[PDB]
Design a protein around this ligand. Structure first.
Ligand SMILES: CCCCCCCCCCCCC(=O)OC[C@@H](O)COP(=O)(O)O[C@@H]1[C@H](O)[C@H](O)[C@@H](O)[C@H](O)[C@H]1O
Lengths: 105, 105
């Protein structure tokens, strides 16, 4: 009978094209690799905020009196086959992974 | 500005155990040696620094109405693994954020 402080929405992404790698550069993701008609697809599991303000006080369950709060997406790093158009390689790329509550006194 | 739960982030290069996307417990092959080329699987994980940042539970929570604690959440990354039978690439869950969980008092 639990509530999250922030409302998430997850999807699978099988068609990712563009991304930022762990070094802050913009890279292209190779969705599929076709080897002798055997196809390897890259899928990513992303979680994103629904609203930045679920409740109107910002986050849910916050002591609205002392703090203001909002909901916001944070990322993690996932390895992925990529190019920078100079080179094809596996690069840790940045991935939306959760919705978290940020405080402001 | 300030987070409701505190995070800690680690690069894990020696993973052995994991749970795949089907709930099966699988072994991770952290290190593969081919000819004289070693392949070490690297993962970026984020865990809770504490389940109770403040005594109440999560920081900032309306402690009157609300019970709360901090806990990890996960994405799914492809990892080279084994169960009893076969070696393969399986989606396994890895910790990626620390979020606050509510419960009505
Ligand atoms: C629906 C059915 C789907 C079936 C799923 C099948 C998918 C099979 C995919 C197999 C691809 C394996 C691969 O081809 O992956 C190699 C590639 O990931 C390794 O490259 P890299 O990460 O750069 O290697 C590290 C190095 O291990 C480490 O020691 C170093 O410290 C790092 O600096 C760095 O060099």
């Amino acid at each position: 009978g639990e509530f999250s402080v922030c409302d998430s929405v997850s999807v699978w992404v099988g068609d990712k094209t563009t991304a930022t790698d762990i070094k802050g550069k913009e890279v292209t993701v190779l969705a599929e690799v076709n080897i002798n008609n055997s196809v390897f697809r890259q899928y990513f599991f992303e979680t994103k905020c629904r609203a930045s303000n679920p409740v109107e006080s910002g986050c849910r369950g916050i002591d609205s009196k002392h703090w203001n709060s909002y909901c916001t997406t944070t990322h993690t790093f996932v390895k992925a086959l990529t190019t920078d158009e100079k080179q094809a390689a596996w690069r840790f790329i940045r991935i939306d992974t959760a919705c978290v509550c940020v405080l402001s006194r």
